[PDB]
Symmetry: C2
Subunit: 233 residues, 2 copies
């Protein structure tokens, strides 16, 4: 029992007795594109929290610095408390969704090398897509910081892409958040579940949140499958 | 004036010459809004525009900027070097206005220091979407060293334009360049620099450009003329 700091779409965050520490609670809320249509859909909290806890651990083993300490419940994990960088970092392996729209090209077209993209994590501004100069203007980060957020998201793509391959899923794109820890460094934060990445079945089947949005089945089913496959590592 | 069409634009019909390397540009009386959505014929516009562009482009040539400009042919026409256009629209911002205002949710009118440059892919089917460096490399438009060149040039270009407009009392909020390749493969400033293509605030905050058309604040040629007049007071 401790205090609720922030209340999200997918996560409520609580405090502890350790200033630098935070317990994350994954909710059953699901919400669609920016025009937040809201459905609450059972089991989702637990799968997300499992999957995220797993990958994050795997990353930590692979020496990626992150906010993960331990999965504490079905519903909760304990995380290092960081100061969030309002900058969603998207790395794309394949064309899909908003890249596809922006460039009027289909989804499924491979890229090589992969493209990263910043978005201003500002719900009020509808999390707009931005360029490096916009980030500097916003004073989120200068140079050296921008080049770090890239250089490590790529390293993160390289680990993750391999891992999902091995379980027969192609990492189409994902989305990080990073923040500063009590010691000032930058650190992979938030969560890595099917909610913030795209996953393609070797037959084009969507093993991700595009099931809720496009509406091609029930969510917990594909998530369940991904969770099942991950323990193959 | 009699040769064949190379392509029709919303503002400019560009014709051929006997000189493979040279283009004669024809400025039209047509004005088009947002995503080509609404358009009107406004008399004098092409002429008014044609002088402004020829004048600025001349001044650039004398201040050492490579451009596609050779001479003004007449009211409606000028002669230009043929370029393989770079389908990037390059926007430099000095003050906030319009789209930057939209995306970042703040007022038209705030000084930026430094000025922000922004690429859009010149592709009307896509409504010239806003793109970032890595999209340009994707799109196969330019390599790094070149994107860096487009940047550094649009900057020293602002640092001339801003002054000249200052001296006649005009606030260069933002503009929008286009560059292309000349006969010897050198990047070169081209297209046009009219008030269709930039923002020029009055000291009273009055709109000395196409925002008069967009926001329908009144008629375009009044203002365009006032700028032509003012520009003629320079050197
Ligand atoms: N280590 C951390 N310290 C502080 N805040 C965090 C940390 N990790 C994630 N967060 C934030 O917790 C919030 C969780 O709510 P969530 O529903 O994920 O947000 P969103 O609705 O933006 O997706 C997010 O705004 C995220 O930035
Ligand atoms: N020197 C040049 N050589 C060849 N094409 C040019 C040159 N300068 C401009 N252009 C192109 O000619 C067209 C001019 O039509 P315009 O109405 O200005 O285009 P838009 O409707 O895209 O604004 C544009 O596609 C522009 O890029
Ligand atoms: Cl955009
Ligand atoms: Mg989130
Ligand atoms: Mg044009």
């Amino acid at each position: 029992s401790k205090q609720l700091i922030y209340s999200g779409k997918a996560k409520d965050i609580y405090t502890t007795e350790d200033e630098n520490l935070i317990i994350s609670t994954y909710k059953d809320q699901a919400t669609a594109f920016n025009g937040v249509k809201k459905e609450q859909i059972a089991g989702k909290g637990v799968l997300n929290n499992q999957i995220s806890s797993f990958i994050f651990e795997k990353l930590n083993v692979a020496g990626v610095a992150t906010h993960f300490v331990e999965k504490l419940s079905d519903t909760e994990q304990l995380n290092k408390k960081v100061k969030i960088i309002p900058l969603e970092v998207v790395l794309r392996n394949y064309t899909a969704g908003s890249f596809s729209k922006r460039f009027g090209v289909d989804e499924g077209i491979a890229l090589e090398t992969p493209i990263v993209e910043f978005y201003y994590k500002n719900d009020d501004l509808d999390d707009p897509f931005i360029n490096d100069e916009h980030v500097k203007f916003l004073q989120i980060a200068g140079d050296q910081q921008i080049a770090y957020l890239k250089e490590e998201t790529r390293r993160i793509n390289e680990l993750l892409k391999v891992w999902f391959a091995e379980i027969g899923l192609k990492l189409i794109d994902f989305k990080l958040e990073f923040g500063f820890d009590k010691d000032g460094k930058i650190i992979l934060a938030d969560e890595f579940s099917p909610d913030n990445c795209r996953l393609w079945d070797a037959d084009g089947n969507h093993m991700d949140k595009d099931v809720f949005r496009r509406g091609l089945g029930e969510l917990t089913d594909v998530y369940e499958i991904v969770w099942e496959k991950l323990q193959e590592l």
